[PDB]
Amino acid sequence: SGLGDRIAFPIVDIYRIAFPRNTPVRASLPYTGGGAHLTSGGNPFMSLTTPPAVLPAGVALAALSTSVATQYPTYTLPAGVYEYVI
């Protein structure tokens, strides 16, 4: 009849996860039409919707989709800390 009707529990732990700067990390768009852009430590990084054809050094297109919807791919970043403007 419906999804999440009787109960719907937020996974709050994921909302608080800290990403280790010293490791390769993962990024993708958050919604079905969720345009987003990245800012590496205050420095503008990438329009994740349309990353530059000359990608920033070390970043790559990830194999598994892992986005909100499988249509979007993920992009792996070698290290660092980044922002999410959506």
Added chain:
Amino acid sequence: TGGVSTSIYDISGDPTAYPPAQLVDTPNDYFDRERMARRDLFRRLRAPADRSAIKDRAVFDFLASLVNPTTANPVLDTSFSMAYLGASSAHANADEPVILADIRSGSIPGLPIPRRIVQFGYDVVHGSLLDLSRAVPTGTFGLVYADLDQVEDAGTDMPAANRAAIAMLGTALQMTTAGGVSVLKVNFPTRAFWTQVFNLYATHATTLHLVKPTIVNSSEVFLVFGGRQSNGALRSTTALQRALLSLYARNAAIDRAVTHIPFFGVPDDGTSDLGIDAVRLFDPMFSDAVANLPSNALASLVSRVVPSSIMFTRVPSNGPVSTTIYGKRTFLSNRRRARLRDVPML
């Protein structure tokens, strides 16, 4: 004035098996002249609008929420193929059922846009003519919406109606692709009909519900088969019995209410329960004097209406002024009047 008080019953969800032969059946008097007459009378009393538009909208509201149980994703999807197998009948001012405009426009929230829509039946214009009781050279679709009447060739001949219903159900299923969904309107959910349903189509779908909009007093229902497949295991279960019992209860309840209403053409000679009583006086002179006829008539009429409102008018003619006092008489007023031993003066 409008609106609908609908209800939905998931049948496949109930694990309690219940033999179909023990289902409740149509009441014996259901096709008595009087009950049929009241049924028609109620149909007139509803405010004028497009009955099918509201009825269809309610069903599609449910369908937009339908989600497969195994993988928790909506059964429908954008660009899905739909056949309005129900009789597209140039309803009212339009040449096709009005709900199609909303569907094509995405007006219904949560409902995806179909890639194309095809129409069938007897009264189509933008489609093809055919009888749904036989085999059909029609291909297949993802959604089959079978809004077909059965009464148009069977007034009260139940076995004839049952055969029509069963036949139409079979063809409707046959037009659905694997994993598709089909709905069917049934005029008379008869235990004989239910018997054949599980005798034949028990394996053709994964899940089943009952959608029951109420626009006027009627026993018709909407079946909905989800997950068109080959190896289903549908059974008659106690949920079905509960739904039927609740359904007939409402139908009886409404009929009892209608009994108080008079029919249309008859002038209100004071035999109906819900009639109107009125008194007319010309240049009346009310006073506390004994035997003052205007006072007596006034008190008498009031005693027949008290629980309801009392209306009053003064209309000047070219000569005298005509006064009229009136109100609705009800069975409540009768009870109150029975309590009286004498009529009080106003």
Added chain:
Amino acid sequence: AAVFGIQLVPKLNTSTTRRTFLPLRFDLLLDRLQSTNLHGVLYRALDFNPVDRSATVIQTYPPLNAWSPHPAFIENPLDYRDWTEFIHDRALAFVGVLTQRYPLTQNAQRYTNPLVLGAAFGDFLNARSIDIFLDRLFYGPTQESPITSITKFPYQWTIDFNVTADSVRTPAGCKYITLYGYDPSRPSTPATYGKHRPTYATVFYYSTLPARSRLLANLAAGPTVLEHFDSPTYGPHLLLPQTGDVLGYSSSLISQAALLMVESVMDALRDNANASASTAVTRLDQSYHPVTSFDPSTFNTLLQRATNLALLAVQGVQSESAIPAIPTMSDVRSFVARLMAEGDPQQWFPYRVDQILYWPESPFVPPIGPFYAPFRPVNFPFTTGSYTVVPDASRPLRLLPQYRNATITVQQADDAYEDTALSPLITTHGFCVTGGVSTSIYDISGDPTAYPPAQLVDTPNDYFDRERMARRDLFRRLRAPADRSAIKDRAVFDFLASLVNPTTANPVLDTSFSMAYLGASSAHANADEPVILADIRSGSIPGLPIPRRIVQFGYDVVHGSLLDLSRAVPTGTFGLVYADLDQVEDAGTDMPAANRAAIAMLGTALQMTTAGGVSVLKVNFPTRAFWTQVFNLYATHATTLHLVKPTIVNSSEVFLVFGGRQSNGALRSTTALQRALLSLYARNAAIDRAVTHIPFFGVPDDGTSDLGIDAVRLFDPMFSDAVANLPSNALASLVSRVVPSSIMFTRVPSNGPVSTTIYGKRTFLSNRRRARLRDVPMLITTTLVHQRRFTTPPTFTLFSSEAVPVTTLVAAGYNSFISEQTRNPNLAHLLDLGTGPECRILSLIPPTLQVTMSDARPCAELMASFDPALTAYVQGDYSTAAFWNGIRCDSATAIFTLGAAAAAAGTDLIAFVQQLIPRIVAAGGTRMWLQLNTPLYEVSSLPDLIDIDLRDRVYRFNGGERVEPYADPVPLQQAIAALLPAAALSWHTLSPTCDWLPYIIGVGSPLNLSDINTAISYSRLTPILHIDTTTPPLRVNPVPTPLNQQCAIRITSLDPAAVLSVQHNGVEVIGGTPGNVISVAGAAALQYILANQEFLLQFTPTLPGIFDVFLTTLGQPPVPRGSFTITPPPTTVVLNMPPPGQLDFTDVGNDARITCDPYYQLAVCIFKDGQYVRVNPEKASVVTNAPNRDLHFVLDLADNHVLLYLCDVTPSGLGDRIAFPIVDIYRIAFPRNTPVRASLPYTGGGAHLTSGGNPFMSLTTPPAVLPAGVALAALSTSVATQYPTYTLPAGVYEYVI
């Protein structure tokens, strides 16, 4: 259920309770008369025109409708405005009289006698005294009837109101009043049935039955007396109509009595059509009934017929068509016309003089009187039930056949058809081709394979036969109207805009180029010059530069000069010469004359081009004689040559294009030319075959054409399952002639009967299906007999209004393939998998072949109509193993079913087929055609038709309407080979030769040419795999099969006498014998090795793609022997770079070595706008070093922000086949400690510099006195040579662009 010309539905309905009468109270009467407006209260206008303030026909209401106007009013009617004034005056005056006597306060409760009130009021406005009536205005309803109250005074009250001891006589009041301007001749005027006349009848009220008898005795000698039995309004009464007639209602078929009956009958029908159980009514039976001077024995006058219908109407019958609430004269005429039509009279209920019989099962309820009695007809067909009416349809209807178990012999079908068909018919063609072009281009100079001109294919011998020429002209008409030249020119100029020189990879054309439209500017259509010039001058064509000026020449010019192009010309010269000249205008079929004209014009056209220019020429007839002279004379006048062939209508004309006008060219006749010509003639032959089915224009459709229309017309048909029912027989016969096509249906109401027409298109497919029949099945009539609407009249047009979608094209192509394949004489049976319930395969197969078809759903066709030995239908699911029990065949097929079945089974293709094919082999099958969906040529989604999924191997159809799995071809073929090692395999797709057209045009479906390329691509994604186990398979040594390389192919065979052929793109490319063989795809050597019983073919393919091979011997058809694929060379270009110490930021930039195949010529380009544009050499250049190509380039501060590519070089396009990003330059830093370089990045690329966060310079407009240390560099080194570079002494800078 029909009476004369009246049609009746089989359901009965009528109301169920009678409303009792109540007299009017005195006060209420005054209120009605005192109403501020009497319209809608006392009278109503049926005819009001709001534009004016006028109406012409008025309907009256009880207080007034008793009036009979004096003749002075009748002979001189007043208008509506006077009427409303007159009534309001009289009503008020009448009230005053009624109130001058009988003061209201003492009389409000009393009941008025309706009869007295009507008579009194009627006299009053007749200006006649009424005093007598006022004494008897009231009566006590509880004590007497309104009649008996009057009979208390039995004498002649007045001349128009006479009362006996038992009865009252008075003229009947006028129910309608006609104002000034009334005209019965106007068919739209409301009908009145003559009641407007003051004395149309006379009523006799009676108090008791003996009085009724007494009255009838007097009236027996006059006209027919009528009476209502059910509810006689104010009381029981006879009425005597006037003995005359009324004008305008029919062809004088009428007397007054008949009019009263027929209108009464209409009212009875209307009530039955809308009575409801919830509503009481004043009277169940609205019919009149004759009681004097009547013949029950005859039915040859209106009155008799109306009576016979009325006796039936009382039972509660309804008409098939609704009747208006306010009938007009036209409506009544139609009713009477039908009533007077020839037909049987009903005889279920007999007439009886003064008693009416009713069916006890009818919903009718009798009143208390003795005038009604129950009765039992023996075979009454009706039943109780409601029936609603559907509004009419604006479109002709379509139906889908459904059959009963009955069938009919062919002869009966034919004779039933031949006397009901519109055998000679007038039709319209419409337009077959809606628009678009199928265009193809052939580079000729690119092919190195020399081919002598004398061996070129030539024009077919019949190409100028009258019939083919006639069809050629017919096709020209059938294209939708537009500017042929506009589209044709646009296609060519699209190619020219992309033309690029091969040596230096720059576009041949340039801005401000000089152009001469040497072709005949001919004031085309509405313009004075060819319309394409407007686009050219405006730069509308993308990628095409603007010419500096345009000059025009020819015979039909206006804005130019006249001259003959066959001679020397006194002209200058131009960069582009566009020679769109016809040759046929002076040579209809004289080829040598045409050849001389073509050659001469070609020579002059070349002579007008400057060096390095480009010229094009349209050639009507590419004749081998023409080609011979071309290379005899102009072989050195240009560098390159192509062939551009747009197809707008079926024609053999082509466009030559000579690039690089120069003196020392080396053009040759080469195999590319031969390939193009063979393909060209193939299409023309294919198109001609399709057109053969189409009839010419003026000929009426006598049934000799293939694509004709068949129609049958019936008047008031009565379909039934009864034997020999002619409408049913004709219906079944016509359907049998159309089945594969759609079936149309119409109902048009004439003034009398309704004409029904059923029609559809006959096709050769229908002929094949009809040949399969042994008997004609009968149809189920419910769908048709239920249709009671009216429709628009038929259309009878051959081609629809809208082009078919791409999917249909693919379906037709595969139908064409199957239809051909099933002609093999060595097939004895066939099993079809996944047939539709409609067994469409029957239309494709020759009737002599045994067929078994299957589906989960039941078949849609009466299997009894076929020979069971030749056809069989099995209901089941061939996904299950249980399906194969007793299944025997020699061959099988499955088209457009496998992927769906696999999706339903929830599995991939490979697993699905692996468990399927063995069962077919087990069933004795030998060969099969299977429609697998897989990318044969490349993985590329069609933007909306098919989306290819990769994370799972799935196709998406129509944006996800349908979803199916897929597999890759190579793994699939290996899997198949594993299952069957000794079977041959081959692939089939839509041919670019369009041989499948007759299955699109010949079936009457329109088309758009531009879709064809997509359809082919669609087929490339959904090939048909042909598996054959009765022949050994093909084999080749270098399995990867690389291009341009020697490969050996073995075809084991027993006869050295056999002959071989190989095809590519649907045309033979190699063929011959081991002794001698001819090829147009590279070196080919054919030998037969008897010791191995093989033909050996050694081959060096010069082009990629699918190649299929056949063997043939003199007494046999050609035999397929598998197919093979040739792969293109690899796309891997690699660059090799210097160390950072050799990153030359100096003026002399550094150099990088390129490692690549020589097959791809390369140049440095910029992906500016979706297309690569070649960069100027002074920033980067591919180096033609002797051992290999290298890459010199220079470094500039713009490089990191831009992208540049090594692009494939072809004269057709730049970077088409490969385009490799030169990634290093995108990400190379610049040393701060050195002099550096900067310039603008684009042709109009404004830029500004920011030195280390400090604004530095607007590089577009740098400071007039430059910042210290910077200088203008010597070498350009910018993106384009026009911009200079600026050298900066040191530092780090930004680029804002």
